[PDB]
Design a protein around this ligand. Structure first.
Ligand SMILES: CCCCCC(=O)N[C@@H](CCS)C(=O)O
Ligand SMILES: [Zn+2]
Ligand SMILES: [Zn+2]
Length: 250
């Protein structure tokens, strides 16, 4: 086996229109949503899940001016939220990590990937291929010479750390099913559901293929029925109220 510690580590924030968390809502109210990374302390070494936002977002809420998402996505990132600075404060440098796991290559999950030039970065083949051409991918999230460990489908990273292929929000989105010493089974949906209501109630939210995202939610509900994990959503302002966060762990 089990992971020794699972840390939730705030990595900045992002404003998103509320129509991105519930596709039925009337656009025009932004929500200041959390961006997370996760650090797993395992017998084999530390594994980082996602890497925050790119340096171009630092003190630059207008990063997406002049793009298809102008006014709809505004990163809220300071110098402290750079993943190398986060990791140094927690006690690590990039080359200390055993693996990086990219849930997907959207900007607030892979914007720090370039900091890791030796650590294998585990990413789904269908996400890597999408990032090579789809417009919602920033160049910082698909740098060409990193040590990618491309995978296809479900995958065991080390004992206690399983990747569940959950496409739809993005073409190769993957969620995590972790077994921890303190808590037992934990499901990190990541962006397979931004919020509890996207998951439980199947409220539609932003995604590349909403129908496929719904089938991935149904698949995760089969896993939930079998494993009864505690479940954490990708950008849920209500749940963030009660999350244990670094230096606490689960
Ligand atoms: C196609 C679905 C969305 C692409 C735009 C995008 O990168 N949105 C963010 C939301 C940050 S609060 C994400 O998915 O993590
Ligand atoms: Zn995403
Ligand atoms: Zn996200």
């Amino acid at each position: 086996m089990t992971v020794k510690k699972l840390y939730f580590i705030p990595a900045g924030r992002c404003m998103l229109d509320h129509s991105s968390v519930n596709s039925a809502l009337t656009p025009g109210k932004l929500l200041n949503l959390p961006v997370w990374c996760y650090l797993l302390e395992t017998e084999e070494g530390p594994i980082l899940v996602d890497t925050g936002m790119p340096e171009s977002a630092v003190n630059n809420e207008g990063l997406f001016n002049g793009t298809f998402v102008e006014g709809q996505i505004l990163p809220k990132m300071t110098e402290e939220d750079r993943i190398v600075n986060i990791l140094k404060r927690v006690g690590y440098e990039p080359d200390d990590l055993l693996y990086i796991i990219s849930s997907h290559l959207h900007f607030d999950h892979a914007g720090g990937n370039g900091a890791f030039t030796n650590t294998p970065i585990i990413v789904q083949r269908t996400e890597y291929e999408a990032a090579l051409h789809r417009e919602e991918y920033m160049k910082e999230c698909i740098l060409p010479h990193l040590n990618y460990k491309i995978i296809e489908g479900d995958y065991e990273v080390v004992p206690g750390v399983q990747l569940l292929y959950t496409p739809g929000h993005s073409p190769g989105h993957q969620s995590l099913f972790i077994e921890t010493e303190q808590s037992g089974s934990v499901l990190l949906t990541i962006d397979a559901s931004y919020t509890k209501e996207n998951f439980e109630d199947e409220v539609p939210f932003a995604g590349f293929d909403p129908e496929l995202a719904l089938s991935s939610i149904k698949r995760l509900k089969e896993v939930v029925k079998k494993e009864k994990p505690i479940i954490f959503f990708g950008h849920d302002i209500e749940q963030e109220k009660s999350c244990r966060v670094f230096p606490e762990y689960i």
